Design a protein around this nucleic acid. Sequence first.
RNA 1: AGAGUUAAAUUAUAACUAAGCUGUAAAAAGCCCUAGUUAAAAUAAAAUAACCCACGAAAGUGACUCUAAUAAUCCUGACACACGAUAGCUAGGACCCAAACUGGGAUUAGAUACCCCACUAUGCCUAGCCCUAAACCCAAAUAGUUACAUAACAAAACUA
Lengths: 49, 86, 99, 58, 122, 137, 97
Amino acid sequence: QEVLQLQEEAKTFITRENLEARVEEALDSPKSYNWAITREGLVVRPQQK
Amino acid sequence: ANHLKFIARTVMVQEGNVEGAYRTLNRILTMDGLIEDIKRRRYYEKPCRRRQRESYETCRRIYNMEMARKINFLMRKNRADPWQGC
Amino acid sequence: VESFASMLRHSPLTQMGPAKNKLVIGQIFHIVEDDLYIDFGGKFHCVCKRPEVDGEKYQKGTRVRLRLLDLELTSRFLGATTDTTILEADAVLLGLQES
Amino acid sequence: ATPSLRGRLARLGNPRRPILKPNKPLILANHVGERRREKGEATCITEMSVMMACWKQN
Amino acid sequence: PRYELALILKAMQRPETAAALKRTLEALMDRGAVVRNLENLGERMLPYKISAHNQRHSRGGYFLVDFYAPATTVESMMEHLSRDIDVIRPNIVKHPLTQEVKECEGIVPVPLEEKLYSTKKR
Amino acid sequence: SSFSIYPPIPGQENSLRWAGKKFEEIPIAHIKASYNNTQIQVVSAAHQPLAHASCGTEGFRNAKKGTGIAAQTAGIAAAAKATGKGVTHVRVVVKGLGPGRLSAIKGLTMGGLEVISITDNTPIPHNGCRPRKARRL
Amino acid sequence: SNEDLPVPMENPYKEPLKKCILCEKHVDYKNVQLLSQFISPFTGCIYGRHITGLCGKKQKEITKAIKRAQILGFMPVTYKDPAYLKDPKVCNIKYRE
RNA sequence: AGAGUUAAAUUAUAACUAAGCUGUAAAAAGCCCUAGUUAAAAUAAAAUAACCCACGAAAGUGACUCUAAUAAUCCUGACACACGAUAGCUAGGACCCAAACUGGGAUUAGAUACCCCACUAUGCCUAGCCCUAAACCCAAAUAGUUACAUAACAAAACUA
Ligand SMILES: [Mg+2]
Ligand SMILES: [Mg+2]
Ligand SMILES: [Mg+2]
Ligand SMILES: [Mg+2]
Ligand SMILES: [Mg+2]
Ligand SMILES: [Mg+2]
Ligand SMILES: [Mg+2]
Ligand SMILES: [Mg+2]
Ligand SMILES: [Mg+2]
Ligand SMILES: [Mg+2]
Ligand SMILES: [Mg+2]
Ligand SMILES: [Mg+2]
Ligand SMILES: [Mg+2]
Ligand SMILES: [Mg+2]
Ligand SMILES: [Mg+2]
Ligand SMILES: [Mg+2]
Ligand SMILES: [Mg+2]
Ligand SMILES: [Mg+2]
Ligand SMILES: [Mg+2]
Ligand SMILES: [Zn+2]
């Protein structure tokens, strides 16, 4: 399973060709790692702003 | 020093009463131990001496904590006694 | 003849399971000013305060509805060999025996 | 919640090294202590100083 | 994913940023790395003022680079990012997705400790 | 009435003024309250010093300038010299833990000056230099 | 041959164990929001268990994540970042009374 | 153990502003090439978390990152082997701050002390020595039991 999984993920890695495209791609798409918790044990996410 | 100024340990006074704002500040600092820390850093305190303090404090806290717990548990039974002059 | 085990197994006090949050029926056998001494039938009486609503309806002999928290209030404290008993039970007085 | 007592005191059974060395044994006593009377500080000092300024001036 | 590169870049325009990211990743692939992904956490005001390369910096762009690399090479990449004047501050952490979460089964309550003292009657 | 204890961040649209100025434009009253003496300096938002008054400047001498009274007197003085140069409102920054802390603050108010925010910036090392040894060996 | 005698089973009634707000969440130095919850707004101190109320495991994860963030330059050290002031308040401390 | 890094302080150093600053139970001496604010490398030390109790054989270890890594299919065992807090020694480098010594100031009958100010060896890094501590949890290692059973106190009593 691990080898197959990595076999899949490898399609997506950054290479000498993808460099130009991928970089310009990532410069377009900001991501957040941010989220908060509630006293209940619940996750709260910011993107609803 | 490299942080932005005025965002920290800052209280804004309300309706111009300053004594109250200051009280609030002092409570903030007491609560976070900043006051005890400031006071304790005036002189140095050698490591063994500090070890001893921490241990004494924790003992003290355990005892006060537990005594308090027994007070609040026993508290019901302070009511007027039913059986008087039995 | 009924073996003790047989009795214990079917008793209402065994039926209850854990006594936390159980609705129960209890009866007031003693009063000091606001203090109602309620026997709900287990072991120790509990003691609750006379409510504000219909205060005079609570009299020695009355029956009331209780929410049982603890069957006996007991704890161990720092340095003690055994627990300490308050010799009381913990209950919340709900209302009186709606009937 | 009370701080943990497990492993803390130095005992024949305890594997590790002491955390607390209690000065006197941790056993709840049967009485509490008597409340400490408040240390006094001077009173009216502000009004005094204001009056003293008023005098020095006039 | 094996290592995580936390890049804080000097805040600049589009092309120059893109350039810095490109040359950075290239350096990574030359120290023998395999780059999995490139993430952009945006540009913000830095939490405090950061002094690097005779500049005192206020804002910065944030990026993550997940990559696999031979253990030997972290020192090398580190050296490299050190002397790049476009990097505000570099760091390389073991990728947080390698460590897996064990299960808090819950909080085991700790009973008060007993028999700390003998049965002496005072 | 919603009143936040927390100050108004610079990047925020937040509208509060005191005599038409933003929270940032208001002068700063620095107060260093140290065990033998208290010093006060009122300064521009842009950090040009407006006024300076200390317990020493106020003509107390060695031990007396430790006390609260002294501190208050320095406060009043500072505030006078300040209002001369036309500062109505001021944000207090209290540096140090001393006998003169509170006193110099409410001396700033007594002396006809208005305190909006009161900040404590006391050096708290996160363990830099080792302080001098304890008294009475 | 008495059928009414008790059976040596484990306690059926026994409650589940209470959980840290985070049991099986993932604390990551990269999100300063979650972290900045367990800080004092005025000082920047990290709160204790007796405030945050965490499994020792998580209190530890939180501490380490905080310090990591603070030095990698994600999160400010001396004050809670003002943005996150109005997020939900998990901790038990009361300053203003 | 290596290598890399730094938030809070602190300081060289300028820029304004003020005449004082420092210092005590109280003073004096010291400094005014000082003080407050604004800027700042190096050095050293590692708030809070920790009301936690983990790692290491012990001594010890609690800023961050990465690399290497925590003997034994696990009985006891030296004078043999390898380590071992602080202080101290040798050589080279560092020096913020602390500080034996010493010099000033008080105190006192005296004060070769306690208190105040300066400053040094030293505390740091590299390399080598030195092998000592109330190195004490004053409780040997490994398996066990809670039976019999109170000198006293303390951290209950015991078997192999
Ligand atoms: Mg061990
Ligand atoms: Mg003793
Ligand atoms: Mg001695
Ligand atoms: Mg710094
Ligand atoms: Mg130098
Ligand atoms: Mg003189
Ligand atoms: Mg630290
Ligand atoms: Mg082993
Ligand atoms: Mg052996
Ligand atoms: Mg040695
Ligand atoms: Mg040495
Ligand atoms: Mg030398
Ligand atoms: Mg020296
Ligand atoms: Mg000195
Ligand atoms: Mg002398
Ligand atoms: Mg070395
Ligand atoms: Mg030792
Ligand atoms: Mg011995
Ligand atoms: Mg042996
Ligand atoms: Zn948990």
